[PDB]
Amino acid sequence: TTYKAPIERPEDFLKDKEKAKEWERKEAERIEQKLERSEKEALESYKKDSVEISKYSQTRNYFYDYQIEANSREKEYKELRNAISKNKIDKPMYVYYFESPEKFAFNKVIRTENQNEISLEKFNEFKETIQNKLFKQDGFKDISLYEPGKGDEKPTPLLMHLKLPRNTGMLPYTNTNNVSTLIEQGYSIKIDKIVRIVIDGKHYIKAEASVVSSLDFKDDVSKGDSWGKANYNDWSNKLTPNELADVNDYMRGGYTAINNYLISNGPVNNPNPELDSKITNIENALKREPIPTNLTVYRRSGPQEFGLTLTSPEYDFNKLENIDAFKSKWEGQALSYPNFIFTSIGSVNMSAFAKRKIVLRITIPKGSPGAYLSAIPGYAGQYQVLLNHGSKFKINKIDSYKDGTITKLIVDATLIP
Numbered sequence: 001t002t003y004k005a006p007i008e009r010p011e012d013f014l015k016d017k018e019k020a021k022e023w024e025r026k027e028a029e030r031i032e033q034k035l036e037r038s039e040k041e042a043l044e045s046y047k048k049d050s051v052e053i054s055k056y057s058q059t060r061n062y063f064y065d066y067q068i069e070a071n072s073r074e075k076e077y078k079e080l081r082n083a084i085s086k087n088k089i090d091k092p093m094y095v096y097y098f099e100s101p102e103k104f105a106f107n108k109v110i111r112t113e114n115q116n117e118i119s120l121e122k123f124n125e126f127k128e129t130i131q132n133k134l135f136k137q138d139g140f141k142d143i144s145l146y147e148p149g150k151g152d153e154k155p156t157p158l159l160m161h162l163k164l165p166r167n168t169g170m171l172p173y174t175n176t177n178n179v180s181t182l183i184e185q186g187y188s189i190k191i192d193k194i195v196r197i198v199i200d201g202k203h204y205i206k207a208e209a210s211v212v213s214s215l216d217f218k219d220d221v222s223k224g225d226s227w228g229k230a231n232y233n234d235w236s237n238k239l240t241p242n243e244l245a246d247v248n249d250y251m252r253g254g255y256t257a258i259n260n261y262l263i264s265n266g267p268v269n270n271p272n273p274e275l276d277s278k279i280t281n282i283e284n285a286l287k288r289e290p291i292p293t294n295l296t297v298y299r300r301s302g303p304q305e306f307g308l309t310l311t312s313p314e315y316d317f318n319k320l321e322n323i324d325a326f327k328s329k330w331e332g333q334a335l336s337y338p339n340f341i342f343t344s345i346g347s348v349n350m351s352a353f354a355k356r357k358i359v360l361r362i363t364i365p366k367g368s369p370g371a372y373l374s375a376i377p378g379y380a381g382q383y384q385v386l387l388n389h390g391s392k393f394k395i396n397k398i399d400s401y402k403d404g405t406i407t408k409l410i411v412d413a414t415l416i417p
Helices: 017-032 037-048 048-062 067-068 074-086 120-130 219-231 241-263 273-288 321-332
Strands: 093-098 134-142 158-164 169-173 179-199 203-211 296-301 334-337 341-344 356-365 383-387 391-403 406-416
Touching: 017 179, 017 321, 037 048, 037 074, 048 074, 048 134, 048 169, 048 406, 067 074, 074 169, 074 179, 120 179, 120 203, 134 356, 134 391, 158 179, 203 321, 241 273, 273 383, 296 383, 321 391, 334 406, 356 383, 383 391
Parallel strands: 158 203, 356 406
Antiparallel strands: 093 158, 134 179, 169 179, 179 203, 296 341, 296 356, 334 391, 341 383, 391 406
């Protein structure tokens, strides 16, 4: 019933370092026979410039499609992505790695380098920060296959114990006097439980984490449009002639009137029965074929969405002070939208929003109201998913990147049911 792996291994090697490194070394040799010349060369370049290449793979998808094509770092990325994608795992693998608590927007110190005990106050504070949240992990990363011990490098007070699902690309490889295992990440994680462990006389927080399956097309708008059409090609017929007419009017210009009406508290301090009817029909059309799976969508936000303007001194993210302030005000907070939200299945930059500094990366839970509007023919909108009005987004983490000379932000948010 079950596939017989070429080299047998448990799901979790636990603290057994010998079984783990032995398996890792045999699989590194076995996988070497499957690789192309270009893929081995990519692995050699990775051994020399691991930091720049991993950094590139984290934010490469936020650029224009032609910029991604022209980027000299793209070929190395593609080869190293394919090298990993060749070895998709046959069954789950629990992996270990140290993380900075800052990756989960925890700004306090759990314990210092010299310290040995973690207070229950700091542990409960950390638990409150990571509970009921999904965090996006992205880019090339080396991980360990066993729980770190006394003779191992343990750079932080935080040990991640992550379960990688079946079919995750996982590449053990022989380095320069060591064996390592490389992954591409590119998933949402949830920290199910945090425990206080002790390794060589010091306390560490061990966070039991799992991958929460999600569809993330990133720069692959072709694969994303194929999904949207396979799921929403028949959507317009599921609607009443009036719901379809109000979706088309909204989609093709009526959004300006309706959105301003909702944003200016119109339904309360100036009701428009004609506009209220349109809103009700569009809301009901989004409840007809709910989002069928967890889906990551991207929105290039205007500064107005975060109470800013193009001339606000706080909208200058090239100043580390302004990045710190935006994160202080928003990380861990809820973002509420009175209007319907236009989002894309693709992360790429577009000429209509070229200068927009805040990229809102929304994970949409399965069953949420929403629809792939781009399945309706004759629509100018590129790879769009519309979300319901009055939606709330929990911001989990905010990151930054250089778009040429302009620093921009990536707000990793979850749609709240």
